[PDB]
């Protein structure tokens, strides 16, 4: 079906990229392939493990023994006790819910924010050498063997090098 | 013969999680009682293997 254009440029996921969360894919004169950015993947796993633990471990816990007995003649108290309980129920239920809700919100943005940072890092290297074409795919104006490629992903991309060649293909038919 | 940290009239429960909907009456060092039915906390990405029949 149709979809707002405000929806993340990279439309689909990759059952293909099994090794990690974020990562790349290449089509060059040597074959296809996927690749997981381990260092970023570990990073995010470290952070999320922390949010999970925070949400869990930050919660205090006194030894409590809820529960009280009264008789047919201490009903006012019993109702005071009732509301202290219902009172706490309505509180925790509400915070337990909005907490997971809002934290689930932020966590799926983290991830979004995270790939968009990867795609940024790349479009910043491959200045003119490449065409940005959508769903976060760059096409090359120049051959790009498994050096060039393990290189763009190494953060170590040579721009002058392949620039000369690419200069001419931003011309031809 | 088992041990627990949190007893309830219905049975024992674990305490390695923050919330719990087994029972309001509790003895121990217990999870907070909530009237919620799920409290799933996303850790990973949005699963989108297909953009089909969207």
């Amino acid at each position, epitope marked *: 079906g149709l979809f707002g254009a405000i929806a993340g440029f990279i439309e689909g996921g990759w059952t293909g990229m099994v090794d990690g*969360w974020y990562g790349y894919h290449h089509q060059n004169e040597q074959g296809s392939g996927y690749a997981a950015d381990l260092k970023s993947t570990q990073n995010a796993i470290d952070e999320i493990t922390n949010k999970v633990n925070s949400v869990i471990e930050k919660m205090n816990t006194q030894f409590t023994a809820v529960g009280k007995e009264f008789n047919h003649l201490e009903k006012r108290i019993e109702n005071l006790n009732k509301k202290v309980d219902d009172g706490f129920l309505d509180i925790w239920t509400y915070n337990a819910e909005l907490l997971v809700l809002l934290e689930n919100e932020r966590t799926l943005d983290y991830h979004d924010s995270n790939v968009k940072n990867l795609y940024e890092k790349v479009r910043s290297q491959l200045k003119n050498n490449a065409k940005e074409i959508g769903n976060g795919c760059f096409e090359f104006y120049h051959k790009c063997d498994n050096t060039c490629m393990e290189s763009v992903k190494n953060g170590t991309y040579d721009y002058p090098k392949y620039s000369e060649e690419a200069k001419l293909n931003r011309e031809e038919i | 013969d088992c041990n627990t940290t949190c007893q309830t009239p219905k049975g024992a429960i674990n305490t390695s999680l923050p919330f719990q909907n087994i029972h309001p009456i509790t003895i121990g060092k217990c999870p907070k009682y909530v009237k919620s039915t799920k409290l799933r906390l996303a850790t990973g990405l949005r699963n989108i293997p297909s953009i089909q029949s969207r």
Partner: nanobody
Framework: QVQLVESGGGVVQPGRSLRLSCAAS????????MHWVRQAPGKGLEWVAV????????YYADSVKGRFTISRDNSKNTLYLQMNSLRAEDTAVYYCAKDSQLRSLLYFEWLSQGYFDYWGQGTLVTVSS
């Protein structure tokens, strides 16, 4: 405080099977990854397998992939190694060990482990015809 006991070691004919247990005491078992480590008689230390706290992630040394099955029971606070079709190369003393990291998410085969904070007194397993 912390206590880890291994058992079920011994001498088995090659090709056959063995199941090690390890009872834990002194900490919240159901919130830590757990490892099995071994040491060939006189040789170095070989990491062998890790099982995540919830138990939906099990990872093995290349050299036991296929034949060993790591498992746990938080109910009993014990950790198991079930070795199958044992070679003599498998003869070793087997140390049960604790990951330092609380609730580590082992979503991936390669991610990092904590360190090994507490060890078992270790039980030896001899494979031999």
């Amino acid at each position: 405080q912390v206590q880890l006991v291994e058992s079920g070691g011994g001498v088995v004919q090659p090709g056959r099977s063995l199941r090690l247990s390890c009872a834990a005491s002194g900490f919240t078992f159901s919130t830590y990854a757990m490892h099995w480590v071994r040491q060939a008689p006189g040789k170095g230390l070989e990491w062998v397998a890790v099982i995540s706290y919830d138990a939906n992630y099990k990872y093995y040394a290349d050299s036991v992939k296929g034949r060993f099955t790591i498992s746990r029971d938080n109910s009993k606070n014990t950790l198991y190694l079930q070795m199958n079709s044992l070679r003599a190369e498998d003869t070793a003393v087997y140390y049960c060990a604790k990951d330092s990291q609380l609730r580590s998410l082992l979503y991936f085969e390669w991610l990092s482990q904590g360190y090994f904070d507490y060890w078992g007194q270790g039980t030896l397993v001899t494979v031999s015809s």
